[PDB]
């Protein structure tokens with residue numbers, strides 16, 4: 239029993255972290271096979287940040303201008319190319335610690351773990367969610383760029399995020415491992431405001447199921463609702479609309495607890511309308527939305 | 543910016559996890575040098591749990607009765623001894639992945655990361671605190687016993703906890719790596735009720751400093767207090783008494799933000815008396831107490 243915000247074990251990703259320096263800018267890189275992936279803004283100088291022309295800035299850079307260090311040993315760069323907002327630095331050595339891996343582009347609401355690094359060294363690991371406005375609420379300081387987000391299926395690490403920047407509001411923006419940003423953000427020091435950070439409704443429902451499985455049942459009401467009635471309340475509270483795909487995804491949680499998904503929606507509706515009244519659910523005073531239905535099943539079943 | 547509940551990178555501990563089986567009971571073991579540490583209740587059968595005499599049960603066990611598996615390869619057990627509530631299984635092979643390590647016994651309020659394992663394989667990592675009643679609120683299912691808690695100082699892993707059991711209330715109990723339980727708990731299936739789970743006041747204050755550093759300042763009031771006045775309010779709200787040692791420990795956070803520790807105590811006092819009024823601090827609707835002042839400094843400075 240007990241339910242925690244849990245990240246994947248980070249060892250497989252720790253063995254991929256390298257330090258990338260270009261000029262006087264140092265950030266993190268991800269070393270998979272003989273390629274090191276890093277944010278292309280590693281080539282930007284103090285002020286280039288305002289309006290960078292990456293193709294132009296890259297012309298003044300050769301293989302020898304990218305310094306890659308793995309541990310305390312230097313890697314030889316034999317090629318470099320820009321793919322969208324990431325630089326791919328071909329090195330002469332395949333990473334001996336390369337795990338089985340995939341590059342995936344996740345949808346909003348999906349969770350992943352982040353291994354926060356500085357100077358190619360890991361400092362910590364935490365669990366995140368891709369917000370519905372395509373930002374992430376991470377914990378990233380200067381030099382954390384190039385830190386990655388990932389999920390693990392047994393022995394296969396699926397990399398889904400690479401950190402690039404912090405918006406003026408303190409929220410974070412980044413790309414998938416093909417260099418495409420999540421959302422409308424650009425790697426440029428300009429006014430970029432995020433959209434509405436709505437609550438991931440399917441995730442809140444999964445976490446309410448986790449609470450029931452763990453003995454926290456006080457919020458269970460005597461009511462039911464429909465997807466249409468529930469969604470009218472959800473829109474009012476800045477919650478994402480719930481679809482029949484979400485109801486289907488919650489099916490195993492509904493089966494395990496005997497609580498129909500629409501009954502849990504009605505309980506959530508009452509929590510939104512009445513508040514918590516100073517009560518807590520799984521040690522939290524607000525409705526948690528950074529656990530997917532898959533995360534609830536995984537944690538509640540002990541998937542290794 | 544951003545402040546997250548962050549665990550230490552788990553790779554160094556992942557390389558120590560093994561599976562230990564005795565009879566029909568399988569749990570996790572920690573392999574450091576040529577010794578495997580595991581809960582001594584691995585020798586208990588279905589029902590022994592009620593009133594086990596470990597010395598007596600151990601007489602019926604030889605080296606060959608402890609099956610240790612690291613990855614998918616078997617380790618040879620050449621010795622076994624009981625130290626308090628842990629079994630130390632001497633194996634013929636030193637763990638090639640042994641990191642620099644220490645065994646430390648932590649005090650209540652101290653935080654650590656837990657690498658939750660099943661069948662010697664890691665499933666997830668999360669950040670915990672040793673509660674003032676010597677329990678931990680973890681996420682542990684059947685088979686998680688032998689999973690460890692740890693802190694990391696650069697390259698030295700300090701192991702502080704080993705999971706042993708779940709109390710009837712769903713909270714967790716375990717030992718340090720010398721087999722001594724934290725608190726009054728025993729490895730026996732009996733009525734063991736935990737004491738008052740008070741709030742770790744120094745940790746709440748550290749987290750209020752983290753919130754100020756991260757832009758969440760709405761709770762900052764125009765008041766100050768004394769340690770004696772503050773403690774009268776703290777006792778009333780089931781908060782741990784704050785000492786001059788705690789004020790000293792928060793000194794760097796006070797210096798960085800320019801907010802005197804007693805002024806932050808007065809702000810905390812008003813939050814206790816007035817409530818949050820539907821507001822949030824660092825995305826939380828309650829006062830977080832599982833970040834030590836050291837954790838706040840580490841995360842806010844980027845210690846690797």
Ligand SMILES: *CCC(=O)N(c1ccc(C(C)(C)C)cc1)[C@@H](C(=O)NCCCOC)c1cccnc1
Pocket residue numbers: 265279282286287288378379380381382383402403404405406425426427428429430543
């Ligand atoms: C990667 C270095 C860094 O820390 N950092 C940053 C990121 C991008 C850029 C470019 C503008 C693309 C050259 C410069 C510096 C910052 C950061 O994002 N600063 C603001 C950039 C403009 O915002 C619109 C950083 C700080 C904290 C966390 N993550 C990144």
Ligand SMILES: *CCC(=O)N(c1ccc(C(C)(C)C)cc1)[C@@H](C(=O)NCCCOC)c1cccnc1
Pocket residue numbers: 239569583586590591592682683684685686687706707708709710729730731732733734
């Ligand atoms: C280690 C196996 C296990 O899952 N487990 C457990 C622990 C200890 C014992 C003894 C009674 C010491 C033989 C048996 C089984 C349980 C657990 O603690 N069950 C209740 C034991 C008595 O409580 C007073 C376990 C389940 C979930 C999380 N952690 C442990």
